[PDB]
């Protein structure tokens, strides 16, 4: 037992990280088969980032202007194309460490692991959630651009995120691996504000279930509620509304703990209204919303 | 910017994980060069665990009683020996994925990454600290035995922990890779209680520095203190006493933020005395003690 914010093992992704250098600008690329995927802003000077015309900037770049290094060996670039906000660099060598993989666009509230990288070299791995405002709260220094987010299903890496920028508020924005931003953000050096960072209610409930499974039971109350009554409280506290789809996905936790989903909602309602009163749940003084119901089942059952 | 509980990239360790089966009992082994390291309680039946005589139990085991599987290939066991609470199984094949490595015994307050594994297969990676009572607060289900803790220095994996058991309070105990328990615990199924889980003050201070570096500044106050005055407050709050050695190691953070260590101590003193008043620091409602000063520098500078 015990319950930890856990990332996927990163080895399969470590084997895919490369350094991409265009002009004097370097960041990370993802090498899968004979393609290297990186943020298109690799082509841009600091002056370019103010108001970049990526199509016009890219005209001035040839295959030989994209320097791709995997470990300390140079890959030969035989083609390049822009797909939305990512560049695809065709190389003459298939990555021999290519895992089974997919590109998936995730929904807000979904969690994934980030392999933070600098100059094509992995620095660390951490777990986060796509926020309801389509930002993530990462740990990214200058140079971490091209770092990717992923989930693993046995031997299949589903890549869901590529890091592109930090908003003036220090939160992070990026793309799926087709180069489409999450949310409304643009890869331009202009002030961009995020919407309301609401709490992922279905994830809090999953984590309350994990707490019960792990023996933190003090917050369980004598009450129940309804979806409509709960959602009145959710809205007041900038929690995402709970739907029957979210009730469905908490079923096995409901079943294991013999705690009806709406009873756990009524427990969460009192926690919102009363606070923690200086108490903790699974070592947290706040309600954790970066575990999905699938994450809680996975961790609580030991999937590899 | 942004500040995350970050694990080392786990690939170098993933390449070392194997399954070890003795009698009907399976758990994880660490394959380095031509040796597999696993908890000695692999030899034990459920009845054996009540009061095991490992020397006597091991007499009944031959090399061919230790089944070592790496992926889906069987390694040939050509020797076995007990070193304290670990078994060393000599195999006829050097692990071709052996990283540069060392065995280190860490001190309380030191952080490391755990690669949680089941049946020799990695499930997840998370960061934790050796508690001052020589326990760790992990995420370990039955079968996670042999899972290891490590730090990485560029290309060198320093292995510091091997998971052996869960205490009745759901906290975790284990050994260094020489098989010596952290703390007073024994690999026997008998009720064992942990001492006071005190807060790692030097780590809280490092994390307060990380908060300042990342723009969470609200807790900075107009006060300073002395080591003796601070330590009076530390003791009252079950914080570890702060020494000049801990002051030394917070210097670069002191220097970067222009916040004298004793000023940050005076800020921590008020936080202890006043609480957070419903506010948060780097997304936490409690004071985080699982980042060392080295962790904070590493993350805040981007070492790979
Ligand atoms: O995100 C930032 C801001 C930033 C820079 C440095 C330190 C910070 O704390 C924040 N700058 C880059 C960027 C800007 C605009 C669109 C875009 F796609 C990428 C360009 C420089 O490389 C990193 C990404
Ligand atoms: O730690 C536990 C207790 C435990 C078992 C199951 C579920 C729990 O939540 C807790 N049992 C094992 C053990 C006991 C004593 C010494 C020792 F070295 C190892 C033996 C069974 O395998 C796992 C380790």
From Swiss-Prot, chains A, B:
Cytoplasmic topological segments: 1-304
Glycyl lysine isopeptide (Lys-Gly) (interchain with G-Cter in ubiquitin) cross-link site: 5, 90
Regulation (activators, inhibitors): Inhibited by pyridone-containing alpha-ketoamides compounds 13a and 13b. In turn, alpha-ketoamide 13b (tert-butyl (1-((S)-1-(((S)-4-(benzylamino)-3,4-dioxo-1-((S)-2-oxopyrrolidin-3-yl)butan-2-yl)amino)-3-cyclopropyl-1-oxopropan-2-yl)-2-oxo-1,2-dihydropyridin-3-yl)carbamate) inhibits SARS-CoV-2 replication in human lung cells. Inhibited ex vivo by michael acceptor inhibitor N3. Inhibited ex vivo by compound 11a and 11b.
Peptidase C30 domain segment(s): 1-304
Phenotype when changing residue 189 to A: Does not affect ability to cleave and inactivate human TRMT1
UniProt-annotated location(s): Host cytoplasm; Host Golgi apparatus; Host nucleus
Result for mutant: residue 142 to A: Does not affect ability to cleave and inactivate human TRMT1
Reaction catalyzed: TSAVLQ-|-SGFRK-NH2 and SGVTFQ-|-GKFKK the two peptides corresponding to the two self-cleavage sites of the SARS 3C-like proteinase are the two most reactive peptide substrates. The enzyme exhibits a strong preference for substrates containing Gln at P1 position and Leu at P2 position
Active site: 41 (for 3cl-pro activity), 145 (nucleophile)
Complex and partners: 3CL-PRO exists as monomer and homodimer. Only the homodimer shows catalytic activity. Interacts with host FBXO22; this interaction promotes the proteasomal degradation of nsp5.
Biological role stated in the UniProt entry: Cleaves the C-terminus of replicase polyprotein at 11 sites. Recognizes substrates containing the core sequence [ILMVF]-Q-|-[SGACN]. Cleaves and inactivates human TRMT1, preventing tRNA guanine(26)-dimethylation of tRNAs. May cleave human NLRP1 in lung epithelial cells, thereby activating the NLRP1 inflammasome pathway. May cleave human GSDMD, triggering alternative GSDME-mediated epithelial cell death upon activation of the NLRP1 inflammasome, which may enhance the release interleukins 1B, 6, 16 and 18. Also able to bind an ADP-ribose-1''-phosphate (ADRP).
Name of the featured protein: 3C-like proteinase nsp5
Source organism of this protein record: Severe acute respiratory syndrome coronavirus 2
Residues of the full protein shown: 3264 to 3567 of 7096
